[PDB]
Structures are given as C-alpha cells and as structure tokens.
Design a protein around this ligand. Structure first.
Ligand SMILES: NCCCCCC(=O)O
Ligand SMILES: NCCCCCC(=O)O
Ligand code: NA
Ligand code: NA
Lengths: 384, 384
C-alpha cells in the first residue's frame, strides 16, 4: 500500500488507465489527447546533416574546442553569458531545437520544485519524510529528514551500478518502465521505493537516484498534483521556455524525477539563468533568494566522501540535488550520466549547458575530459 | 522472417534498440534524443478549464450546434472554408494546439503517402503486394494487388471487433504495443501481418486495419525510409503545419499506420485543404491531380456491402483509404473509431475536422448523430 497518488486525469481510479484500458471510457477522453504517455511514439516532422558550430568569441581562446566537444560525444552545447547566447554547438543530426535526455540533471530540477514548496511553507526540510509520506514507514526512509533526502545523506542498500543487471538501480529502471519488467518486480516506482532498506545511519553522502523519486513523491502529497504537472507549474511554465520539456512516466503516470526529463539546451540554460538571478524567472519567482544562496554555498564537506568527485574537487560537496565543486570559481552543476551538465559559473554570470552521449555512463576518463572543457570555457569568459 | 526494415537510426542492427538496450552505445546517441519512442512520456508544459466555442457564422443556422458537439463527445472541431477557419470548438481541458489521436483517419494519411509514391512511379497499384514485400508470400496478401489493399477488397480471416479480447484486432494491438503482450504473440507488426490468412477471394470490401500496415510496409520497402519518416517527407513536412504530428511505434520503431497518428485539428485540416487543392500543399505537390480525382470519384459501389455505411450512404464506396459517401454533395471522409472525421465538402471548398471520444468505438447511434452534424454543417456553408 503506497497511499493516495494524483489521478492520471480528473476522477480517474487508482492506476487508471493502463495499457490495456486506455481505449475504454471514461479513460479514452484523456488518453486520446495524451497517447504518448501510454504508448511509445515518434515525432512526424513538420520540417523538410552537418554539425552546427558557432563557438563565437571563446573560439579564439579555445581553437580546438569543437574537436574537444566531438571527443566527448557532445550532442548539444550552449553558453549563456548574462542573457545572451555567446556560443553554440550541435552535432550533425541534432537540431538546435531538438530535446535531449537530461539523466540526473533532472534531479536538480526536482530539487528546485521542492525548494519552491519550501518557500510556500508546504514543505519543512527539517521534518521526517514520513510526515509527508507515511507509507514509507518501515523503509530506509523511515527516520531521515527531507533535507537528508535533498542532500543524499542516507545510507541505503542500493547499488547504483547502471550496467550491473542485479543492482537495485536495474530494478528501479524496471519498476519505472525504463527496462523490461521481470516477474515479481514492484508494480510501480512508489512500491519500489518502499522496498528499500539501510542500516539506519545518516550524515554521509551516498548518491542514490531513489532519493529524488522520494522527493517527487513528497511533492505530490503536499500539492495533490502529478509530479509532471508540479514540475511545470512550479518551474517549467515560469521559464518562458521555447518548448515544453518531457518526462518519462511509469505505469501509474509518475514521472521519473531522478533522470527522465528531456528538453532543449537553450531551455535548460533558462534554469541556470534563474539560479543566477536569485531564483527569479520571467514568469515569476521560482525559489527564494535564500534557497539559491544555500545551493551556491554548498553542503557539508565532511559528508562528501565520493573520491570520484573529491579527487577533482577536494573541497566539493552536494546539497539540494546540486553538485558543488567548492573550487576557486564557486562552480556548481547539475550532472547526469553519459555527460550531461547544467554548469553554473557565477563569476561570469554564465551558464554552460552540455548534453552528451558518452558510450559509458560514468568513468574518470570522461569526467576528466568533460570537466576540463567546462572549466576552460568558464575561464575563457573571464574579463582580460 | 520479415526481411529488411529501415533501421531505427543510421547503422542500427535489426530491431535495435530495444527497451533493454537503448542506454547502451551506440544506441544511446539516438535514444537520448528520441526517448519518447522507447518509453511512455508526458509533456511538461511551458504554458501556465472551460470550452472554447467560436462557431462563427454557422452558429445562426445551427443554434444548438455546441450542445450537439457536446452530445457527440467532441474534443476538437474546426471548419475550414477555403483557406479561412470559419468555425472552431474545443472542449474544456483541450487546447486549440493540443494533439488528438486520429484512429483510422490515419489510414487516409497513409494512402496519401502511397499516392505520392505512385506519382513517382515507385509503386504500381496493379502489381501484387509480393512485388514489394516478397516476405508476404504464403499469407492472405500473396496474390492481391496493391490497389486491392488500397481499396480494402481482400477477404481476410480477421475480426475487427475492438472490444472483443479474442479477435485478430486485439492481437494486432498487442503486436504493435497498443495493448499488453501475451506469451506467443508475434514479435512486431510485420510478423503479425504474415500470420494473416483468407479464402483467397477478392473484389468485395472488407474493412481491415491490417491492410493499411501492409501499405506502410510497402512504403518502407520502396523508399528505404521508416514509415514515420516517409509520412513526414511525403506529407507532413509539405503542409506548413503548426506542429509535428506523432505516431505510435512498435518495438521495431514501425509506425502504427492504420490508426496511431495524432495531430492538431487545424493541422489535420491542412490535409483536407491539400485534397481540395488538387493534391498541392504549401510545401509542394503531395499527390497528383489524378489521384485526388480518383479519391473523389469513389470506388466500386458493388464492392461496398457494409450496411453500416450503405444504410446512410446507399451509393457509397471506399477507395485508396478514404470513405466515399456518394451522396448528392459528393462528400468524402477519412474516418476513425470513437468519432474521428476528416470530412471533405468540395461543393463549398470546405474541410470539416471533428475529433472526438465517443464512449463506444462504433455504433449506429453515434454515426447517426455525427453524420447529422457533418451534413448540417456542410449545408450551412452553401450559398443562400
Ligand atoms: N537509472 C537510470 C539513470 C538515472 C540517472 C542517473 C544519473 O544521471 O546519475
Ligand atoms: N486497433 C486500434 C484501432 C485502429 C483504428 C481503427 C479505426 O479507427 O477504424
Ligand atoms: Na526556496
Ligand atoms: Na498520386
């Protein structure tokens, strides 16, 4: 029993519709207008072959930039300095307005939605997760605070080894529809989360994608809105974005908050712009000045024991779904496997978006190359 | 063995990627930019409750029109007289730019793509299906001509009883991903089509959705393009449409040509405009003047023995994926279950689009009400 969840549509029964009932009334009225949410679908282009490189000024400072982008399997790259796009790159086959999977950069967007609700006083990070999701009692989420979920400081028996077929990460994917279901798997993401356990210890950073989905669940319970709608209402609809974003959903219509969002590079940059603007977007304030300040300030350094991060960023940390480098530039970034970054460079009031498709999800090699590019581009923006 | 099929992406192996391999290289580069084709996904609106009724002039002639539209579960309704939108209606909850499933109206779009290839001489309707799809040898499609598929004049052991769980129509849905798979089901739509049989007779009309998917298969073999791309290249991209259309795809990426297309009402009207313009669209000629003339002329009346159609349209017929009323106005229409119509009224140079969600897929009751509305609106457009 996972309790009350936002109906797929007004008046919809729990879990309706399913792949086998969407053609039946009363579900069909909603389904006929949102079939992509039920069945895999392709776009039939309204528009009738080569990479687009417009690395503007930074090109002079970084002559081999395009080659470096190709070497890191770059699909879309965009640099926003202030309110101006000063550099752009799109691989052959990927249009400037095409959307790209954000993977874990999605987490930073979810944390933003949580921050908005904290500002409204609908969520108190000091409160235990169970204050909002009682059904998580008896699980590893029984005891920890919402802030500990936000900062990922909960010890959990969860193997985030993507390529490993036995890990909890694969089960998470199967429960959400990212992979084929196996007999006995949890029915949906909510159920999967309730199966998680840990030794009860907290305080130390442990990257776990389940944490973000718990945040999305909390968002749904406090607002009564499907996470998909909450993500739009509290964030996307206030960005004056060029295109809607998309998010994969499981069989109940629950969005894969931890990593299923897709959007254009230019629109993702609008999220960064909002962060550098103290939490304000064209459509209104998204989060408070305080929330943004706390994100830029970083999390507890002592909690950050991930050498995969500290080897490059010794004074790094993590807080509210954002990775904080703690470097001399105060860089903070949303990160997603296979090379996704929503990189903030407050010094130059710039945002760097890099959406890629490395063959591997996470290796020292790829991160070394990628971070080298992000840091070089950031420095190229400094006054000289 | 169903032979060669267009790769999901350049260089992709047969059937790749699958739900279990899209995160792996080299598939991920394509998948990260088209995840909706692999996993059900929802739109995250970039925009921040009541029906919109703008029945313009025809309102005076049809005072109870809005109520009649509500009674027929109308989601979107649009009347294009010449090049001008003279009447519009959208139910509460459905925006003017929202897309709606077309069901079998999709068939008329597929027939249009076939017509384009006939004009190019890449398809000869007189040729047997096996001339283009040899793998269909041994099936009910071994012997009939492409034109017989176009006109649906092939006797097939296929129960098109949607609500019936044992029918071939349900198996068709499961093979394409519209319903949950059962153990033993064909792997994809191509395989399903090869399992179809019949007594060998032809000449009499038999509405069968499998026919359209065979047409789409032929389209792929003659062009080398995924049907999804062919639908864009030969039709959608030439309409100067406001939005892309979408089409559900099966596990191989094959579009559900017989009924999985979704688009806005205004854009669907552009297809009708093209038909009334002799086959020409803003982006170029879609089909020949001759093809359009043949569609408007109708098919063999003797072949049309469907009382569900002839009771209302005694001189009606069917040809090239279009229903021809044979009425005094020469009305022709694309039709899809649950109330979808792309209705052509050549007399007034008008197109009527009605996208609905009747609780039932097909009953005399709903068709009586729906046709009454389409005919009344058509007559309201006559000069007086
Ligand atoms: N389990 C699917 C991948 C989720 C995203 C994880 C990440 O980007 O770190
Ligand atoms: N088997 C799914 C429905 C296909 C559309 C059929 C029709 O609209 O006539
Ligand atoms: Na806040
Ligand atoms: Na033609």
């Amino acid at each position: 029993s996972t309790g009350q969840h936002p109906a797929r549509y007004p008046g919809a029964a729990a879990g309706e519709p399913t792949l086998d009932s969407w053609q039946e009334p009363p579900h069909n009225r909603w389904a006929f207008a949102h079939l992509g949410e039920m069945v895999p679908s392709a776009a039939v282009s309204r528009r009738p072959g080569h990479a687009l490189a417009r690395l503007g000024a930074i090109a002079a400072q970084l002559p081999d930039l395009e080659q470096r982008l190709e070497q890191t399997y770059t699909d879309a790259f965009l640099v926003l300095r202030g309110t101006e796009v000063v550099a752009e790159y799109y691989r052959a086959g990927f249009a400037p307005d095409d959307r790209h999977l954000l993977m874990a950069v999605s987490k930073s967007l979810c944390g933003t939605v949580v921050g908005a609700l904290v500002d409204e006083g609908r969520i108190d990070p000091a409160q235990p997760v169970t204050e909002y999701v009682p059904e998580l009692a008896g699980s590893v989420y029984d005891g920890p605070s919402v802030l500990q979920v936000l900062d990922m400081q909960i010890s959990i028996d969860y193997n985030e080894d993507y390529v490993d077929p036995a890990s909890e990460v694969q089960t998470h994917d199967r429960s959400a529809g990212w992979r084929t279901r196996r007999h006995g798997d949890p029915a949906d993401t909510y159920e999967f989360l309730t199966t998680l356990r840990g030794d009860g210890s907290t305080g130390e950073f442990q990257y776990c994608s389940a944490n973000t989905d718990v945040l999305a669940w909390i968002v749904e319970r406090v607002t009564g809105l499907r996470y998909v709608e909450a993500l739009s209402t509290y964030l996307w609809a206030k960005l004056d974005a060029d295109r809607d974003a998309t998010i994969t959903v499981d069989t109940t219509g629950f969005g894969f908050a931890n990593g299923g969002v897709s959007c254009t590079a230019r629109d993702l940059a609008r999220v960064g712009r909002m962060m550098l603007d103290g939490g304000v977007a064209p459509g209104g304030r998204v989060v408070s000045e305080d929330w943004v300040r706390r994100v830029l300030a970083g999390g507890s350094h002592e909690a950050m024991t991930d050498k995969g991060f500290t080897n490059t960023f010794p004074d790094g940390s993590y807080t509210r779904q954002w990775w904080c480098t703690g470097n001399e530039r105060g860089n903070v970034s949303g990160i997603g496997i296979h090379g996704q970054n929503l990189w903030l460079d407050p010094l130059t009031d710039s945002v760097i978006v890099k959406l890629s498709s490395w063959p591997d999800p996470d290796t020292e090699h790829w991160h070394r190359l990628q971070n080298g590019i992000l840091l070089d581009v950031s420095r190229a923006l400094d006054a000289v």
